Amino acid sequence: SHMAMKPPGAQGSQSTYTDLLSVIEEMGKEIRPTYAGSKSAMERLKRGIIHARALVRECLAETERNART
Amino acid sequence: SHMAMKPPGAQGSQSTYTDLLSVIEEMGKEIRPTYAGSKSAMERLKRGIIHARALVRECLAETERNART
């Protein structure tokens, strides 16, 4: 683990993978309307997990070949 | 069958990023009690996004070194 209290933001210029970074936040913000009983935002929140589940799965393939530090 | 194959760890070279694939689905399980008004589960859902977004930017460090899309 790494608690980035002093981060570089991200700046990982890899759009297809940065979709994953985006989706985490898109869900993260729409947790509040979901919690307020909005099934519309809840369905979007779910669909974010499906989107991000596929995102990680596809990236795993080349990240296996990458695995850099 | 179902369009969601789950490989735990074939080649050991995507291991920290495999944890992220777990976190995605573990946010998926928090959605239903969050929507049902459970503030504890909602906090676990948000802290799931905090965990997930961290793991993405951890990889973005090495993923900017990579350049596909």
Side-chain angles (χ1 to χ4, degrees):
Chain A
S1 182
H2 166 220
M3 290 185 175
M5 293 299 298
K6 180 191 64 188
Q11 198 177 91
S13 306
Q14 194 75 144
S15 303
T16 195
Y17 182 71
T18 306
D19 288 298
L20 180 59
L21 186 72
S22 181
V23 172
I24 306 305
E25 180 176 89
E26 296 302 272
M27 296 182 301
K29 64 188 186 185
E30 295 192 73
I31 300 174
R32 175 180 59 176
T34 294
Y35 184 60
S38 305
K39 60 181 181 66
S40 307
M42 180 282 296
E43 197 65 70
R44 290 175 51 97
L45 179 59
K46 293 172 55 188
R47 187 182 179 187
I49 277 67
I50 284 64
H51 187 190
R53 195 65 163 82
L55 284 167
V56 180
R57 183 182 174 206
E58 293 173 63
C59 302
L60 280 167
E62 66 181 297
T63 301
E64 185 189 277
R65 185 181 61 222
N66 292 328
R68 300 296 67 206
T69 298
Chain B
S1 183
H2 182 248
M3 300 176 181
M5 292 299 176
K6 179 61 185 296
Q11 292 70 88
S13 193
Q14 61 182 214
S15 191
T16 304
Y17 187 51
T18 296
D19 184 79
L20 180 49
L21 186 64
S22 303
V23 180
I24 307 305
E25 183 175 88
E26 303 311 280
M27 296 183 300
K29 77 200 306 171
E30 301 304 314
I31 301 176
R32 304 185 59 208
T34 293
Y35 180 64
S38 306
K39 59 181 182 66
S40 306
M42 177 283 302
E43 183 54 74
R44 290 166 49 110
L45 183 49
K46 299 189 298 76
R47 265 171 159 76
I49 274 69
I50 272 58
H51 188 172
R53 185 173 183 79
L55 295 177
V56 186
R57 68 183 176 191
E58 293 307 286
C59 298
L60 283 170
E62 69 97 81
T63 309
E64 56 78 71
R65 190 179 303 176
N66 177 32
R68 300 294 68 208
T69 306

